[model samples]
Target: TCPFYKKIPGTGFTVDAFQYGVVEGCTAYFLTHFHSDHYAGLSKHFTFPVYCSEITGNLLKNKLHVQEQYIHPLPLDTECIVNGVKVVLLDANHCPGAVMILFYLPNGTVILHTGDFRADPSMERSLLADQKVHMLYLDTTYCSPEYTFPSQQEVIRFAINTAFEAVTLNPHALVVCGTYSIGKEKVFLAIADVLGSKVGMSQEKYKTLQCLNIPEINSLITTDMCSSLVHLLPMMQINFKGLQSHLKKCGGKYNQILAFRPTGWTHSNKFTRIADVIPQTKGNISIYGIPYSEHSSYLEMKRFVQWLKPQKIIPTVNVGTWKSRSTMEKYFREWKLEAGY
Candidate 1:
């Protein structure tokens, strides 16, 4: 009974969180993205068939080692039937192959499970064409008004410029960018294309990227640490201690290391909402946290809810975090009323 996993009454379909063993008699499974929190408990031993985008399915089989027989790939914008329920997958615009699940039940109720997504005008238009939503399972990661970060595209430009300037300042240094194992490929690819150099990664990470078959990024993979001017390492490797440890083993071949972390957590002016690079420096290593995110802000969430006008909003997070069901209910009710939904 996790907040992330909801069992539709009378339908027997489970969304996102796959708690209880895979062998449990669930009718069907729906995965929004490959993020570990949303994909907990799914592995090679999964018995029931799971549905997601083609790229997500590939990662499930190749990266997570889930058996192909139980993996189902759904194309974007297409509607299909699973266990007598009409399901449609829409581009979430959160990460590569991320999607929002829209379920049309036989009882004339439509449930929208927004698996980690940012608000986009095009996506809003596509959804509005359909009927209204009865229930909305929201990705409320930034559900507070204080979370007003800049758009991903704006942050990407800022990160690219910052990376180039850092390399210019330290000619003999190596620029290492941090990213998740799957998402954030855009940041690395853009930097490589602009700098006209290959990007280095671990063999496992390179193999994961290879499965995407993206020509722009596929040609940029290199296992050699020194083969490229910039290296793409996991997000955990971008800190000062991590950089220090790696530089010690390199025999001082590179005089310095510049690391960049593109995330939406960086704070900004509440009124103007301009994106800026926040830096932390230690010794010859400098790390910057750039404002980039895939989830909608509090204001964006309000706008999305107002546009969709769902009868009820369910927060897709740990239920234990909230004081009670009424507390959660009151919060969303006030928000919806204030937004004129």
Candidate 2:
């Protein structure tokens, strides 16, 4: 089962392998989310029959402007047979439109492909408790033993408290938050809500959110750049140069710039607590890298794998090198042994 690359082994379907573009033995394309890394190869030039969540499908048509004929958005948690194969989408808990693909192959094997998921007990109890899984295509983003971060609630709260204190101390401090187009939105939103201020963003970013048709998010953002001290920025623009350029553009109305860069890249074997990560300051600007990730932490991944106890652990990430993949295999073996399988 682990012999194939992007497509599910022994199936006529491919999962999140758009870059390949109609590879052999593939009848349909299955997308898990709207993240660029997964939807890299998709464009207006493409004509492949692709299936994704409703939001993801909306994004494809509105954001990327793909042809409507090729897009098929499926209902979540409901079984749909494609080419006589039972397929279902489970809430991934990673991003807004993200999902875990479940396939009941004609060979009577139950395969669960978690395309970048954050594991929680609710998924175990509600979605997957009753199934007997034969194979698991896991999101091994934080599969190693070293990556143990706080819960999303704790991390978001910590960032909010930190921002609240900074903003309280310096009322005129301008806040800038780094974010992806789709994921890790809670940090900046929470920060803005703490101040009772609407967030400002680029016209494109606002339009991106507008395409989702989620009015709860739509009314909260502003077209006026300087209306709110809290400003939205892409993930790359949280640096000194970016801060300086923005402050200069704002004509020095704000006293200092406070920025929050939220991502899962923050790793720790040293800091035993989330609050221990202090703010980084240079001159009047301060930056904080919040360990906020949509993917499951190592402990969560272990718990998920141990509970599911699939016949094979086929990782979907960080398996490029032999040594690197073997490292993950060690973890799989350890988890399997603990589960007494």
Candidate 3:
């Protein structure tokens, strides 16, 4: 019944969330991340003895509120037998709830399914060990030659330095930087590490980061006391008029104000329209574009395949999405492999 059709419940199978085929006579199911692209049909497709990382399970239960029976949570570096398949969860630096599944099949055929990972040496050095990996499913999500990314540490350092410098230059000015709720926790931590102070987190972001078990950035302030330091708010919820009003209320008394936006509004020209609406004031707004991302870059994808020497590399999640196909195709051509499985 679930072979060809798309919709099963509220979740429909789009290009990002489609199911190709079912695993025949397989009792164990493996999930690597909580992204919609990877686990969109999770609730609809009832599988017994499902396997995933403890972090992923916690997110599914706490954030998504799924049934506990549907998960057999395992920690990273730990091996567990589920329905006769030995599965090991590897750290995937893509996102907080991300992981890579290493399936140790009984037939001696080892499969390394890297759900979505970058060649982040600092965060993912353990996964790059010289191991005999068979049938490697690489994250060619950014396999395109055009996609280039700076190092994570470099981005983090730059953000920290930029924020500190901005704060120093204009003590009373507001520094706004954008970031996503899932993977950008490190940015805030880096800010805290460099600035020696904690940043306020929105209620939603704080809860999300907590569930992901991300380390607290020094002393993180809650939403209640945001006005004391920086007006911490989501970029989408940033009200130009209201902000101006609040700044006016301050009577230019505050030396400097800082707002961290995790999204890339500065890069896109369309956001200029929104920025134009902001009334010119003494407070300065700086958008920092640190090369921090969850997905692996094109070069990183190739490096993963080269290191593991996998028989085949397949891209699962984030495929066919915006720029995903181009990235994957570029890697395919670079590796001189035919497209599709």
Candidate 4:
């Protein structure tokens, strides 16, 4: 039932642990990112040695209270042998410390688990060049052809500009940017640097950002909301209903409040294109769903698979049943054949 956990044929290493009750016969564990879904059921009591990037390892230790003895930090692009299997960690480009794992099995097979990453051009030349990938564990979060969002950098610019314009148009308005607890710090950092304003975040988020040790971001975080015009709230707090309630409580504290949720699920039709900002108003609060995502779009995924040229493709999620597996296989086959791979 745990699709994220992948076991090599002879090597007993497990990739990710979603449900702690189901773990069985795994010699080692590797975490790609600190996202909750990927790290579900993990706790301070975890006994196994969990390998991850330095940033992720710190999060586990400082944020989650995982013991240092159980946290193993793996340097990116370096190969290490565990349980007689050679494994290398490569930058996933999804989050601060997210990584893609490459495994070399004793039986002369190579497997790649792209934990959760956007398609980066450099990855092809640096990681996959001249290597035969036998099996690829793909991140199909946006596998559908309908998902055609632009790059994160383009969307970040749009979000920053839009927030600035909203605040400038209405001097008394407060702009709230929506983001996950860990990801999308770039958007907030860009807005802070360009707008010359600090970002107000919760103590939890502030601590996490402090651990990143990025000067640009470190200088922008403030716990006091009144100190800045722009505020960074968790994704759940910036939704339409949430903003409506917040506006009521605000009680004209700000003339108007604008909420922006940057995501890739903005376009589902033929007319909408990348970097589209669709605005919706609810009472005094204005919400905009901007096209921004870290995951690869269908076109990007096609290009990634074409370059990797793996013999078998395994979807990272929803692979428990035959029907689900068949559906993912069909999607992969269509993309592969159409891409002339």
Candidate 5:
């Protein structure tokens, strides 16, 4: 319900609005996850009481270096009173530490602010199903009807199979998967696990995996870049030029560079477009684009809205224009009507 986006109505607490430094009339702060976009304006210099999920608090202290005194790590599915308002963190299914926030205000407003979530069947089991929710702050990243596509598991399966085939065709090919600090680890981790190859990551990325607490997957990561044929590099560096640069940087050890760039932007209408073969010959520096999106698709979003049946929805993304907001409202209206709410 905010034109300001991050400010929660009827509460002094602001959610992920640190980029504005300190907004006036705000009492406390809430961080949904460890993602940069959510925690952008936060720094060690800016000291304030911040509430978040258990793992998110871990990353804040370790990665962002937020002080212990200001951090409030809330347990999931359980409510705790923050300034007399009941707040709970639920699994968001976006990143490792991402959580959807639920605020039970003292003044009859039960707000379910879904801070960046993919539509998962698991979420239907949350307290939102039974609780009387007033307003829903939705993750409108892919709100348009045209944004519907395969699920993360589907895309990961396709990516792994494609990477498997590429390496099978050429055993000597260096399979480098594009990576981020927080999310999209499933694509590369599955690839390296299925292929039985060690993954080489930069010092920062390797340490990030440690905080993520996946000992089974983290066991395969090596700081020794030379030892592994499968390397996890920055997502932007998966291009042809970067491939060549990486090839040279590795002392030309491998016969060819086979890179997999996992992202939401790479999706195509064609179902077979699992991998966008980089046009170069298979023997050359070949690259593929996998649609490994973390956000829920349009259909997924609709289903979630239809199921939740909140009284009013406030979109949290792509709300710059009135046209976009109105267009998005049409879908929400239909979903609510379908739910008979």
Candidate 6:
């Protein structure tokens, strides 16, 4: 018995676990994105097929190395039937293969699960008009108004401006930008847009970018092959400190080296010293911190939840962190409403 299942002594429906033909006999389960938290349970708990967007499926196969038998690919903007449930995959403009899942049940119940996503206007327009959500499972990573995040375009512009200025300051320097594989691709595209053919991309990075499948962006690259080199070589692909050490080995012989890394490093004083580990040379090492986050900010998330007017708004990501179900309940109570519970 679970606290949520009022009809079953607080226990919700169990899908093919204790005794079943499939593990609690779940009619359908959705894979919102390839992020570990969302897809982590699948490779272990269920052997039955899982429904996911085509891009997400490919990432599962290629990135995570999951077997093809487990995946059931759903195309973008198209609805699919899984165990008699109507499911639609909508674009979640956060990452390369991110998606939001909208499930329709036979009882006229609708559930919308937003995987980690940002409130991009383009993404919101992609949701099909036919389905209206009754309940929403949200990604409330940034539910607090204090946590400010810059828009994707704004963040990219900041990084590009900083990188260009650093290069100008030190003619012989290497700029190392740190970002997730998907984000780095955007930065590369932005850099190309600004610098024209002045910067170059590596083979591994190019291949990762290609996986995103944005034809217009892909066509902008001069090279047909992944490893192809361009006339400009201002940036190098490195994950973390490796990029720094790699530059040091080259002898910060260059005037300056610019690197992009997570803002997490700036949150604390003690961890700040870790930056000292990177070797310093005549060409100083500069780290550019930008407000780039994939999840929607607190206000935007609240806006989405409000738009759905769901009976129960469940915070999936960052659950029990800041404004979880309890916080939502408080909001509803203050308004003398029985909405967000």
Could you say which candidate leads in lDDT?
A: 2
Using TM-score as the yardstick, the better of models 1 and 5 is 5
* Best-to-worst ranking by lDDT: 2, 5, 4, 1, 3, 6
How do the predictions measure up, each by TM-score? 0.90, 0.95, 0.73, 0.91, 0.93, 0.72
Mark the 10 consecutive residues where model 5 has the least summed lDDT. Answer: 274-283
Residue 67 of candidate 1: its Cα lDDT? 94
Task: Give the alpha-carbon lDDT of every model.
Answer: 0.77, 0.84, 0.57, 0.78, 0.81, 0.55
Candidate 5 residue runs with Cα over 4 Å from true position: 1-3, 270-283
* Candidate 2 accuracy as TM-score: 0.95
**Best candidate per TM-score, number?**
2
Estimate, for each residue in 241-310, the C-alpha lDDT of model 2 and write its tens digit: 8888888888777979989887675645345588677777889988887778788888999998888889
Tell me model 2's lDDT, rounded to 2 decimals.
0.84
Summarize candidate 5's per-residue lDDT along 1-341 as a digit string, tens digits.
Answer: 32467888889988887787668888989988888888987777768899988788878887788899998888888868999788888999888888888888878888888888888877888877777788899999988877766778777887778778888987878888887658888877788888887789888888777777676755788889888878988888988888888888888577788787766754463444444434344447877766677889888888888877788888999888999889988888778777799
In angstroms, the error of model 1 at 266 is 4.0
The local lDDT score (0 to 100) that residue 21 gets in candidate 5 is 60
Count of residue pairs whose backbone atoms collide, per candidate: 1, 0, 19, 0, 0, 17
Indicate whether candidate 1 or candidate 6 has the larger lDDT.
Answer: 1
Task: Tell me how candidate 1 scores on lDDT.
Answer: 0.77
TM-score of 3: 0.73
* Model 6: per-residue Cα lDDT over 1-341, one tens digit each: 21121011112222112222343434444566665544544443346666677777777666656678877788878777766566777877677778877767677777766766786545445663455667666666665556555566766767667656655665565655454445345665565455443234555555555556676755566443222212223234433455556655554354445666534222432243322333233335555554456777655665555555666566554444453657655754443353433
Where does candidate 4 have its weakest 10-residue lDDT segment?
267-276
lDDT of 6: 0.55
Off by over 4 Å in 6: 1-22, 41-47, 121-131, 180-184, 196-208, 216-244, 251-253, 262-283, 320-325, 332-341
